[PDB]
Short mmCIF file of C-alpha atoms in Angstrom, two decimals:
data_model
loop_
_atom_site.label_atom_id
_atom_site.label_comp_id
_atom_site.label_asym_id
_atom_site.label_seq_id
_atom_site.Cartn_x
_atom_site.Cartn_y
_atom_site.Cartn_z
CA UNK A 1236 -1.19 164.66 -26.10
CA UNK A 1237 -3.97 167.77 -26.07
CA UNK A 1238 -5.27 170.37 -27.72
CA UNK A 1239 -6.22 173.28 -26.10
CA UNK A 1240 -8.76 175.99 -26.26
CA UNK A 1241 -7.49 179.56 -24.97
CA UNK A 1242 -10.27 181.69 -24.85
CA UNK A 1243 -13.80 182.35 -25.19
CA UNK A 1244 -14.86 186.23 -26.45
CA UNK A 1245 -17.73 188.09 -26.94
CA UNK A 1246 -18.45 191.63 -27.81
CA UNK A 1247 -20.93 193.29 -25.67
CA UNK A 1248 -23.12 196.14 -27.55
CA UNK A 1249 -23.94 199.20 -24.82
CA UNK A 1250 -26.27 202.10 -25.90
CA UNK A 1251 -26.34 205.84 -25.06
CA UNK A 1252 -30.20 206.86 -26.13
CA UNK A 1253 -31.66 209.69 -28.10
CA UNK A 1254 -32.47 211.88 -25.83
CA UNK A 1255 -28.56 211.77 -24.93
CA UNK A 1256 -27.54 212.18 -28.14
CA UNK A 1257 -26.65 215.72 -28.96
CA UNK A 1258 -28.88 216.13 -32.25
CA UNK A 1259 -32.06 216.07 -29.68
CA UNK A 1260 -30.61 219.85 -29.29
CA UNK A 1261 -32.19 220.83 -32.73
CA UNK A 1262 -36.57 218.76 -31.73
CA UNK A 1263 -38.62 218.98 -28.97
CA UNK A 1264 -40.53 215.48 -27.14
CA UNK A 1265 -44.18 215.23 -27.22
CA UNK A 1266 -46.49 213.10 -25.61
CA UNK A 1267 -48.40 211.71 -28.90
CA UNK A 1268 -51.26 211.25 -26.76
CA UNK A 1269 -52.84 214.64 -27.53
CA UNK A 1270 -51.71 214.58 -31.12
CA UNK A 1271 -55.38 212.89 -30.53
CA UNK A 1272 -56.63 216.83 -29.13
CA UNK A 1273 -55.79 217.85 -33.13
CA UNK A 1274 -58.07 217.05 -35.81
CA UNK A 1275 -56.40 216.16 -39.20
CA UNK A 1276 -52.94 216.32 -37.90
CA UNK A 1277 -53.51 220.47 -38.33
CA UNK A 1278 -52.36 222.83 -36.05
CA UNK A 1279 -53.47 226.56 -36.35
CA UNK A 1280 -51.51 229.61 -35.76
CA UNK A 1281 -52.68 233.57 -35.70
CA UNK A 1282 -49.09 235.17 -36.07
CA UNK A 1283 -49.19 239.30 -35.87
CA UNK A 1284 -46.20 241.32 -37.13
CA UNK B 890 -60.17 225.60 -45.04
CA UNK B 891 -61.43 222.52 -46.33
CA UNK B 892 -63.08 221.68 -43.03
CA UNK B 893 -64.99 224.10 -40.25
CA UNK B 894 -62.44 222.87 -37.57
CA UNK B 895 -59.47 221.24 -38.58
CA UNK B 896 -57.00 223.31 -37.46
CA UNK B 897 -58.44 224.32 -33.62
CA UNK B 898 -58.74 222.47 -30.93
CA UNK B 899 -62.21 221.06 -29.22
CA UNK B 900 -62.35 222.46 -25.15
CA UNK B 901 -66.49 222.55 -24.12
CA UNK B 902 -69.86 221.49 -25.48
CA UNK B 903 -72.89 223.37 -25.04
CA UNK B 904 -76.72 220.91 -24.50
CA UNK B 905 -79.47 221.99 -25.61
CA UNK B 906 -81.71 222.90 -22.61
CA UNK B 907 -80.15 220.16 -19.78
CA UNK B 908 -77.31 218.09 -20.28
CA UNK B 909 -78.99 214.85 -20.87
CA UNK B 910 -77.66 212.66 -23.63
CA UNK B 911 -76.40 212.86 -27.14
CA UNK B 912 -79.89 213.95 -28.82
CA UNK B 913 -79.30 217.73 -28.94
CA UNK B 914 -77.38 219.32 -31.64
CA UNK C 1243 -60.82 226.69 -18.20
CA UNK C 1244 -58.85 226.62 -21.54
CA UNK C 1245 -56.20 224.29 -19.78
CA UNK C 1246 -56.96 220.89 -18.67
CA UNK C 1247 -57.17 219.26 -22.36
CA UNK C 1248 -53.36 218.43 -23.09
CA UNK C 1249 -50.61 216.64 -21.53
CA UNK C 1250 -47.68 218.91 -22.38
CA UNK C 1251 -48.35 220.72 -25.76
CA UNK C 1252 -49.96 224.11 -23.66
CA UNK C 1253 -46.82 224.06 -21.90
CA UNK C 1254 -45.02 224.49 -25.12
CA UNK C 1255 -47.05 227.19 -26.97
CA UNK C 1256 -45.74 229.21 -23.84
CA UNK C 1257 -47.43 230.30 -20.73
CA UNK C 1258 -47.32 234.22 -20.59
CA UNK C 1259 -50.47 234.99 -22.79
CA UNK C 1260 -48.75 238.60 -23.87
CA UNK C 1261 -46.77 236.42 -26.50
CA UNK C 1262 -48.70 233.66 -26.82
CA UNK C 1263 -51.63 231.94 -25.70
CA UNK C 1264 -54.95 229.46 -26.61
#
């Protein structure tokens, strides 16, 4: 006279990354490393009309 | 402009004379 | 001689120095 143990479950978590996310239409990637060719976190711009 | 060159990047350096150490303006 | 300093950020700004350029 038993008892009995029917199953063992686990969820499994999968990822699908930013860059494959569709909101990565609207920013551009950098490579940080020349955010170091900046001083002050500044970038300068001469825009004509 | 708070300072001389925040905004711009930094490309060459010019030595006073010969390129020898850190000494020259 | 103005290219050479950054890994990818040049390549953004745009390469065809009539619209912009460093």
């Amino acid at each position: 006279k038993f008892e009995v143990l029917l199953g063992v479950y686990t969820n499994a978590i999968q990822y699908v990354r930013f860059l494959e996310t569709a909101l990565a239409v609207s920013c551009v990637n950098t490579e940080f490393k020349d955010l170091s060719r900046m001083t002050d976190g500044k970038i300068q711009f001469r825009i004509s009309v | 402009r708070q300072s001389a060159a925040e905004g711009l990047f930094h490309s060459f350096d010019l030595l006073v004379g010969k390129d020898a150490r850190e000494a020259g303006i």
